[PDB]
Amino acid sequence: RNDVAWYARYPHILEEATRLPFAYPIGQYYDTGYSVASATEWSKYVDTSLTIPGVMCVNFTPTPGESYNKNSPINIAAQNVYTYVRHMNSGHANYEQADLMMYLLAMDSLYIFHSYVRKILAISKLYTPVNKYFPRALLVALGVDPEDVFANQAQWEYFVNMVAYRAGAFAAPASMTYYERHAWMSNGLYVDQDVTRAQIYMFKPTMLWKYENLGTTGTKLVPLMMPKAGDNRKLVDFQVLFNNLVSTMLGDEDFGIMSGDVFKAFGADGLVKLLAVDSTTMTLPTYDPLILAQIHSARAVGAPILETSTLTGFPGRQWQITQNPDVNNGAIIFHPSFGYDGQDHEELSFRAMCSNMILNLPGEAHSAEMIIEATRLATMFQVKAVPAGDTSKPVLYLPNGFGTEVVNDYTMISVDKATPHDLTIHTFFNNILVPNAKENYVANLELLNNIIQFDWAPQLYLTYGIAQESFGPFAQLNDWTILTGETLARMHEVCVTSMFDVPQMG
Amino acid sequence: RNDVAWYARYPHILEEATRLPFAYPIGQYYDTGYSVASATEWSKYVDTSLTIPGVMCVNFTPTPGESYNKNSPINIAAQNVYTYVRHMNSGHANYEQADLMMYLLAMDSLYIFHSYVRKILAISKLYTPVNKYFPRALLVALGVDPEDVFANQAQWEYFVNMVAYRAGAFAAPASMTYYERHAWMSNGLYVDQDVTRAQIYMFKPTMLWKYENLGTTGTKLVPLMMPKAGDNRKLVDFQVLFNNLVSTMLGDEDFGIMSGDVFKAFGADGLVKLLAVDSTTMTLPTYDPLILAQIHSARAVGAPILETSTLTGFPGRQWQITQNPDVNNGAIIFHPSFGYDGQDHEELSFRAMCSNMILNLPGEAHSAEMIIEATRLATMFQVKAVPAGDTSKPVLYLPNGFGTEVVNDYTMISVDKATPHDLTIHTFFNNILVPNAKENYVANLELLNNIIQFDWAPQLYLTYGIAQESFGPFAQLNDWTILTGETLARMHEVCVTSMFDVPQMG
Amino acid sequence: APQLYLTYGIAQESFGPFAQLNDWTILTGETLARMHEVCVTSMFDVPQMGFNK
């Protein structure tokens, strides 16, 4: 006997038969060819296409967390930060506690805008040969014309540096981890897996909050919609958005008084610091398992309701943080209605979000910080909003609670399988309607296969038009649990409390 | 400046894009597929096949070298070997010089038969995963049923060992390099290139010489045809061929007297030694540039003419070495007529061999031994044989001289491009007729592409039926020369002299 | 020499690569496309720039 293996007797045969090219670049359409050469007689019955997506952008909206009355966590936080600022600024101050908190929320929307345009500037340096989505797909997902950023690099750099210089002239506490959380989410690129051909997660604000001081009936934060993906917006549009954001704050006396008071209370080492940007500044896609766990359990709440929204049967449901001194004893009030999808109709997919959510985690041992960070983008409906009128085309919902930000949409950027193989923009909620047409089933299947390329992708709740039936969470579960509205509301009420937290005076 | 190359900045991209499987096994049909997937509408206009040949067998016939009278080199050699044997065997001998030389030629045909069946036995052990022609194509080219050699291995081994025991009981001088040359050609496998997927050259005797002592009119060596490629001959047929070969020599008194005289003249250390064979015995394909140079300049002379050949207008032209004592003063006589192709018609391709040959060599400096070994299988026609009668269907030729062996045919073994992809046997001369039919042009092109896979393949002389025109040497030339019949005749007359050479007594 | 492909109009038939092969591989369109992309990206690269110093 010899008892040596065949692969050890001829290792050259094995190493020659298995030399294959791997690491195909993504961002590029690939045609697989035919194994049966005669199968071109079957036109669409043979799928020879292979498109890999690269960008899924989480479209979000910063919130204070469901204010109903003066006992809300943002009003308790307003009380604590005004007690801290007031007993560090001995003198005569004219603003209330809620004017100070609304100044802090407008400061947050400014910092999100600055990190947004800085991400537009810092993405455009990204190149790698093995991912062709860099950097144009990431710029398409942020709503900017990518050629405008390359052609006007110095004007863009001046604009973002002047946004940092202007918006950085107002003080905000860095002891609040609210600003640090939005800076963490809003200027980071996140891979779904620690590989080089990984797929990118991003966070883009759907809307920001514009201050809008009015009359004598307090203040009223109103939405300012950001560019959506596929819009080829240029630098002048972002300049108009910036000037619309700080129109009521630049060179304003009351905002300067509040900024100097926050400067004197929290010292210069205890304020937030905006980041500068040059031609050297670039961000690299990092692996963060805390980001992926809350992208996984994210639930999209729909489009923001504006003044120009024409909700049939739902007047006055526009999203606004209000501070009327004659209403609710002068409490900061924010309770938006969810389930709006931009149009004046029912959107039957939101019925699929009326079941209890699934909280899915990797591993088998879960920390309390891990569990509470994995639930930060989740938002469950609790009741239906009451239709005021005879008929009502849409159906709105009221949650039990939400965190410092709600998800509005997701935007997936892939390549088209038809020539010239340009990028494709697909915007979706967690819920997806498939109406009865032949051009919807294979397209929905393509979208589902595109979504399952993303590792900790949000859980899908599809529904069918002729089946009258929603299917549950389309996601691979590892170690799951069923959450109810009260548990998630407890976690939201904990996290809104922790984000708006300041120390004491001693 | 950095001035580092792109391939040094991303070496992983280059090493991933160029990982391809090489070293495809030969002996196997490969389908290439389509690059235009719609091109199945063009049925035979897209060639997707790729067949690599593995065996080209040179079919030869051992000769003494154009005896016309008693001044021939074989008669001078007979005189010298009979003077050597006679003045070492003091006593009364009854045989002449020519009986001794005819015994030596019959001994050569015996040794070629023994090395032939030993090659049949020693090929059947050959296996490699990267050449699927081993060993069945080499056994098909030798004219044996390959399954008979595997099923009856012990009977085959006994038969070849008894051929060596019987035919090795007759003495022959090993000082004659004639026997050593036929042993070199007839039991060696030769690669066209020093690689592992190389293609094999072989030598198989077309015919052998049977002794046929008759009456009182001397002796007459007559042909005994060997199995051709594609014949699935079994062990009983080779046993019948062996018994037909040694029917007039085993247990014969005159052959024993001549064998004992050669034994006493040339000592036991100076006789030829046949090789034994067991289950351990196997031959490996070696690289010999001397074999390839004479395969390159080889010129096929056609089929041997027998008694049962029906040449119209050419009676008595059968190939036979005769020793009539009343004719040519009792000289050994052999002058065959060439250009016979097995049938009773003209075979117009042999007109293409009526031009001067090209002697092609590698390199730029050529040794005299190199030049004279490269011309050993070449044979040029000189005149036409005179037709005796009114009409004559074939056309025969007379050479100016030939060496110790002439080439009759070549047999190329490749794989079929149609299922079940079994072996294909193609037999050809240097000259090739392409008659006017659609099934001949692409087949001839396939045969030409199969021939140019063999490195030092013989030079082709094609002719066309409707063009009435032969094309010249279809071969790649490196450092060539034009040979005439007188130069090649001088080289043949030198080499026949050197092969039949014995030393002196002192 | 370049490998030839010979179409015979009498036979409505082409013959494939007329060449002597040594160590070969069948190459599809995507592999050749990847190699072309690698070489065109390499040919138009400027190492004088600050791009990946």
Curated annotation (Swiss-Prot), chains A, B:
Assembly mode: Homodimer.
Presence of the UniProt keyword Acetylation in the record: yes
Residues carrying the site annotation Cleavage: 22-23
This protein's encoding gene: Segment-1
Function in brief: The capsid protein self-assembles to form an icosahedral capsid with a T=2 symmetry made of 120 subunits.
Modification after translation, per record: The 7 kDa polypeptide is acetylated. Autocatalytic proteolysis releases a post-translationally modified peptide that remains associated with nucleic acid within the virion. This peptide is observed only when nucleic acid is packaged in the capsid.
Pfam families from the UniProt entry: PBV_CP
Entry keyword annotation includes rRNA processing: no
InterPro entries: CP_picobirnavirus, CP_picobirnavirus_sf
The organism's place on the tree of life at top rank: Viruses
Gene Ontology CC, one term: T=3 icosahedral viral capsid
Further facts: Picobirnavirus particles are capable of disrupting biological membranes in vitro.
Protein name as annotated: Capsid protein precursor
Keywords attached to this entry: Acetylation, Capsid protein, T=3 icosahedral capsid protein, Virion
